[PDB]
Amino acid sequence: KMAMIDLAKLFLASKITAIEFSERICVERRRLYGVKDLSPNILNCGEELFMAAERFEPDADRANYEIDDNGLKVEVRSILEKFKLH
């Protein structure tokens, strides 16, 4: 399914927070992991969203490669577009 793409849109719509998005995205990736009949584009899109969330850190003292709420939003939107799922 597109639980991860959906989560991303929910996040971009600000219906859920970056923290919420970053956690649920792990639950959804685990769920869809290994599942067959998956679309490559959708699969990889979900993978990049997962790695983008890994970079998210709400604390002001986050590392230089880490990102905040905004930043994750920009990254996520960019990822959906990259795979044409926006």
């Binding site: 956690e23 992991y33 699969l43 993978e47 850190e57």
Partner: protein
């Protein structure tokens, strides 16, 4: 929890990955973070787990991969546990890590 290459804080913010290490407990408390901390050490300890690649982002981080579980645990240059999760070989990111070690 926060003893050794681990800290309670880091473990807490990364518990979202515990499910990849055989810990399905949906609750996040001192006892679950503990199972997480343990599942990580057991990972690093496994004889089948070996160093493979790095998480470019984190300067000199080293990643330990286990071909059986397909999991990876990232350790910072200073031996501090950074993060970890399961590699998906069917996803470009997974295969790229496998072919090049770049996480």
């Amino acid at each position: 929890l926060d003893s050794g290459r681990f800290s309670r804080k880091q473990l807490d913010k990364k518990y979202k990955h515990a499910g990849d290490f055989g810990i399905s407990d949906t609750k996040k408390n001192r006892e679950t973070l503990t199972k997480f901390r343990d599942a990580i050490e057991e990972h690093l300890s496994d004889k089948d787990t070996v160093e493979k690649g790095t998480y470019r982002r984190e300067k000199g981080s080293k990643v330990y991969f286990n071909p059986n579980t397909m999991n990876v645990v990232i350790i910072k240059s200073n031996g501090e546990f950074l993060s970890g999760w399961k590699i998906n070989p069917d996803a470009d990111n997974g295969r790229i890590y496998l072919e090049t070690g770049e996480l």
